[PDB]
Design a protein around this ligand. Structure first.
Ligand SMILES: CC(C)=CCC/C(C)=C/CC/C(C)=C/CC/C(C)=C/COP(=O)(O)OP(=O)(O)O
Ligand SMILES: CC(C)=CCC/C(C)=C/CC/C(C)=C/CC/C(C)=C/COP(=O)(O)OP(=O)(O)O
Lengths: 688, 682, 147
């Protein structure tokens, strides 16, 4: 209702270093630090105090809801090792060893893509650590040989040389390596003092060196969580970006327009020229944050340059990190493709190759049935991918994408593959879905009511002596194409206005087209504009737009040009009239901006009309492709002129131009049955 | 019982093509159409089964609940001509032959003004086809040469060339027609594919040429009813309009304010520039349907134009149809006259001619006992014509009309006149009477209680500065009679009573300047709530100021009294003009000015009539108030404005109250009073 | 102005076969046009302003109708008594109007009442002067230069 929005706003306004669930493996690998002052107990006893009081009832560890083999294996092995080390509470070690020796046989059916990070470098070293002690585990298994093979396969890609010169993604699993030149290795850690934001690697480096900053980092992260250490920390850039994305794509962002603008400032202030990262102080970058951050920063009206994507190119084939084994990355390529739609004409041509390669890869993977990701499971990835691929930026009305996205949300059923299965909470929650569903239903009620009212008005004004042979379909189409863009609660005076004027235009057009031009007409047509209910501010200045449109009709007769441009211009003018928004033409740049926007809209609509006409008559594909490119150029220019921030015009005017062009461009890329299915799914298909 | 209301609502909102009875003539005529492949008997067995299934005790056919003559003999002969043609159930065939041979002597005593459709063109052909089979006919009888003469007159008025260039009313009875020359006549039938929506004629046309559309129509219409074929089908426009009329005239219209709109929608969606007869197909628009749809549409706030009614104008005479070989009935003319009241000033003079021609017509036929109609059979049509001619729209309160009519509804005994006799089920029922009587009794008891409730307060208020209480409350209740409007009704009455009291006091004391007491405080005697405490006092002070300013002049103060009474109605209930525009101010000002002017004019008329002057000044003032009432009525029920409907109806209520006061005699007023609020029902 | 002119024309076509003059409608049109050009609304929420406006409009309409009737009966071959009757009634209505206008405890604005008064006084003035005096005044007011 409304207290949920308050709870969400409170959770947003106090964001910090990031929230993430704890993990038993890291706690076990941290507890092994013998005391500094010379005592007998471990340095951090809170780790043992927690690890002893969080054992699963089955006798295992790891995540409870989901169930994956490697997670349980690693967590349980780490826990038994941490227990046997200090040799306390030895009543449960056998309870875990039973599970291990009973379920290690079933380690042969796990998928190839779901391989935990640092798995082939942490499982063998942990097994060797177990071998030092007398622990009976089935070391023999046909599956373990695959692990030792993958280990060498990965180690071949990163020699002993580049590990000591350039910081790579390898430092996230360091305890599984020996013979380390610690002299030329202390010069590569993060700014905080931890090796690539990983408590296990910091712990390993501490007990094998005499550093002091790593101890400070470990003590801080231990004290902040009152016992227990997380899988990765901090996340001060990941959470912000993905929370803003999940709030935007869900259709609830309008209530939080005072925090999102204060949440993206932190990202904009740290725009490293070679790309973003997963935090503020990580020296290795990647693509799942550069593309997403860039798109989000550009969609809200900032000044970002896209040439930073050039760093991730290698012989016309992108990647996600500096050196990996299996290039099965669906989310990074998907986010890059989605960020390759926003594109200004003057930008560097790298985005073209980005779009081409990402579309080729995603289409390849969609042909087969390999729609599985290596970072996080979800409820429905193929749905998101198919929607983002089949309906480009030109013809994606926001309300439709929201209605479709109210199904593929994970809620609490999501989990992200790190060093171990760990749950995120700040943007994988339950208030989001419920609030979105409530708001959607509250919108649908008003939509139905105003639809009934408009139907009565359409019947009473005897305006069915014109129009097609099925007026209900025309009314439904021309109201859905208006209630899908201006979807707010207090803009009925614009929604209904758009609907009424669209109906009037589509009636007069048919009446003119069934007679044979404007010369052979005899009725008074200028008076049809009086059917709109009277007012003082709105009407009176609308008959001017109507008379101008009628002059445009009577002036384009001896030629052969279309008329759709002037209809789009009438629609944008009539939407500007309602709402009461002027433009201070006192200064010139606003006047010039307005003129350019109007001309671009008219030209785009005319080109689209020509496309539809020349495609109906059954011509070759070359003409259609040429017209498509010719349209896309001006569409890119209009997008650039609408999203940027140079001239001083009320943002709602340019957004109105964008809405009108989006509608006119969407109505020409779908068959009637599809738009009917969409009308049925958006309005009538009730929620909760 | 309230449950009856929900029952009739559920039976109405699931309406279809109308539920009428079945006719023996049509079933018999359609039964004798033989099959195509092989043909071991007739085509449809359900029709012959129903025929052998529903014999009357006398042996005849038709609805014996109303013993007519013509339809019975016609149906019996046309049924025997098939029951003895297929040679089955012979033991009952001659049983009806004895009936006709023993009762044919009644055709010399039957009424002339009630002759069935196509009688004189279907009876001779029936005798022709009955000649062949072994059966006895009394050929020689003057009652047959008479119908032969009528047939000759009909063929004299209707030549043969009309049956090949334009649709014509003859196509309902194609039995007594030969040499049709279907070459051009087949493309002249209706849009559905029938022949003027008459199954007998379609069967006769399909027998002589193998058309598929007529076959499909007959198959659908026979499989719809599952046995039996109606006299005419469909009836999806006639039934709706007449049902809405008989529903709004009883006085239970306020309950069904949704289905009435969703029923007039289907009328407004088919207002062709010619008219609407009984379906969207039959192109023979007559003037008994238009005169109904036009009036109803203009009453409920729509946009219609009466220039269409001009299409029936022929040298001052008005045609019921294109080829009527008979002086028209009263019901189409009665409906035209009743629809010639809601005239707007900018309308064409077509109504101005109907209003006088139909008045003359209905006055001639009323000056005798010639009140028999032609397309209906009812209890008392002359009484309702009398009522509609005695009290015009200017002085016709709803309660008086519904009370005087509630004892005239035909219940379930209203037979109609087509090719055969049939009965309607939707708007000829007994549930309507039950619900209307229950609601009227509830209203009567409420009024009988509140009258004494008001009289006690009047006696307690010490306002003898009589008989006006009962008349005032009757005038207050004859318009706002809804269940939960006592708050407005009592306010209507109290202010009028106090007003006439102070009006008598000022006249007695000799001017409002020789008054030594204060009078503004008199408003405290009327009950009040906290939400409206001083507004009514402000209006009262405004009325007193208008009086002390309109003294020593000629214009009466009654107009300001009407305006004060309207504002008083407006206070009780609490609805504003809260929207806020320039048109709203202008509409309110215009309505108030019109009300005041009409009230003052009626005051002057009632003053100048008693004086015994010439009868021409009365005619002048009557034409003036008519020219004003037309515009006022237009502004009241236009339905295209932004003023709350009740705030608009208040002005009409007050003006009609004043007009009824000024256009009646005291004894008739008292008769209406003790017939409405004193004499109970049932 | 569109709506005001439409209403005036409808009032023309609604009184085409009556013996009443149509000067009141033109006076109401002029008053509405002045009020529109000035840019002054009227608070239609509370009842007293509505009633005051209705009373003022009815008064000015009746006054202008009476003036038109007197002007018609003047030049025609009528006696010198009916004119005095009409003048007495006109004066009564005018004194009631100036009572309603010059008062100080009213709730409507000040300029609107003065607009009503200006229109009514313009009509009553143009009704009471031969064209020669009108020409003299025109020449003396805006053409005869003062200093
Ligand atoms: C940056 C994005 C999109 C998400 C961040 C979420 C996290 C915690 C990512 C882990 C950060 C990190 C350093 C991962 C590297 C782990 C690893 C095993 C690197 C080397 O092997 P890969 O080729 O990446 O994967 P495999 O080990 O399964 O082959
Ligand atoms: C008009 C109302 C209230 C209901 C309509 C009911 C319908 C559809 C009746 C059938 C319409 C129809 C075909 C009428 C035939 C008109 C006609 C010329 C009949 C021939 O008889 P008349 O010339 O009237 O003379 P008699 O009927 O007295 O013989």
């Amino acid at each position: 209702t409304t207290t949920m929005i308050d709870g969400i706003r409170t959770a947003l306004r106090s964001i910090g270093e990031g929230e993430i669930s704890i993990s038993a493996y890291d706690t076990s690998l941290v507890a092994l630090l013998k005391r500094l002052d010379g005592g007998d107990g471990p340095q951090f006893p809170s780790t043992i105090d927690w690890i002893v009081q969080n054992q699963l009832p089955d006798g295992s560890w790891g995540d409870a809801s989901f169930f994956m083999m490697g997670d349980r294996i690693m967590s349980t092995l780490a826990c038994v090792v941490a227990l046997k080390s200090w040799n306390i509470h030895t009543d449960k070690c056998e309870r875990g060893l039973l599970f291990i020796q009973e379920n290690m046989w079933r380690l042969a059916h796990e998928e190839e893509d779901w391989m935990l990070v640092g798995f082939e470098i942490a499982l063998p070293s942990l097994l060797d650590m177990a071998k030092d002690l007398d622990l009976d585990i089935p070391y023999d298994e046909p599956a373990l040989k695959a692990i030792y093979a993958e280990r060498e396969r990965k180690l071949a890609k990163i020699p002993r040389d580049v590990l000591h010169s350039m910081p790579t993604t390898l430092l996230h699993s360091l305890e599984g390596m020996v013979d380390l030149d610690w002299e030329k290795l202390l010069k590569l850690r993060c700014l905080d003092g931890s090796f690539h934001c990983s408590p296990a690697s910091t712990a390993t480096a501490f007990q094998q060196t005499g550093d002091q900053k790593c101890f400070e980092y470990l003590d801080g992260i231990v004290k902040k969580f009152n016992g227990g250490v997380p899988c990765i920390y901090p996340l001060d850039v990941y959470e912000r970006l993905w929370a803003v994305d999940r709030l935007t794509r869900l259709g609830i962002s309008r209530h939080f327009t005072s925090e999102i603008e204060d949440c993206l400032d932190y990202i904009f202030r740290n725009w490293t020229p070679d790309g973003l990262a997963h935090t503020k102080n990580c020296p290795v970058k990647d693509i799942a944050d550069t593309a997403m951050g860039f798109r989000l920063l550009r969609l809200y009206g900032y000044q970002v340059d896209p040439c930073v994507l050039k760093k991730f190119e290698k012989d016309g084939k992108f990647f996600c990190l500096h050196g990996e084994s299996n290039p099965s990355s669906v989310t990074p390529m998907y986010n890059t493709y989605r960020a390759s739609q926003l594109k200004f004409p003057g930008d560097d041509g790298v985005l073209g190759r980005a779009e081409v390669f990402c579309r080729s890869f995603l289409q390849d993977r969609r042909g087969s049935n390999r729609m599985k990701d290596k970072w996080a499971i979800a409820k429905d990835i193929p749905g998101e991918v198919e929607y983002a691929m089949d309906y480009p930026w030109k013809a994606s009305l926001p309300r439709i994408e929201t209605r479709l996205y109210l199904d593929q949300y994970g809620g609490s059923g999501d989990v992200w593959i790190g060093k171990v299965l760990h749950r995120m909470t700040l943007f994988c929650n339950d208030l989001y879905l419920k609030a979105a569903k409530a708001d959607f239903s509250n919108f649908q009620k008003e939509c139905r009511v105003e639809l009934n009212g408009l139907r009565r008005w359409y019947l009473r004004s005897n305006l069915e002596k014109f129009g097609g042979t099925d007026p209900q379909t025309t009314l439904m189409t021309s109201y859905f194409l208006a209630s899908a863009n201006i979807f707010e609660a207090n803009r009925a005076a614009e929604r209904l206005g758009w609907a009424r004027v669209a109906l009037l235009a589509d009636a007069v057009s048919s009446h003119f087209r069934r007679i044979g031009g404007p010369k052979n007409s005899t009725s008074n047509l200028e008076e049809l504009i009086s059917l709109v209910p009277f007012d003082d501010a709105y009407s009176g200045s609308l008959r001017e737009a109507w008379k101008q449109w009628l002059m445009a009709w009577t002036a384009k007769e001896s030629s052969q040009e279309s008329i759709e441009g002037d209809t789009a211009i009438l629609l944008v003018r009539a939407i500007e009239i309602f709402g009461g928004r002027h433009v201070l033409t006192g200064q010139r740049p606003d006047l010039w901006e307005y003129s350019q926007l109007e001309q671009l809209t008219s030209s785009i609509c005319c080109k689209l009309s020509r496309r539809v006409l020349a495609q109906e008559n059954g011509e070759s594909t070359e003409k259609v492709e040429e017209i498509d490119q010719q349209v896309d150029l001006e569409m890119q220019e209009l997008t650039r002129r609408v999203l940027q921030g140079c001239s001083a015009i009320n943002r709602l005017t340019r957004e109105t131009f964008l809405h009108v062009v989006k509608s006119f461009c969407y109505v020409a890329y779908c068959s009637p049955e599809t738009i009917d299915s969409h009308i049925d799914k958006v309005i009538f298909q009730d929620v909760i």
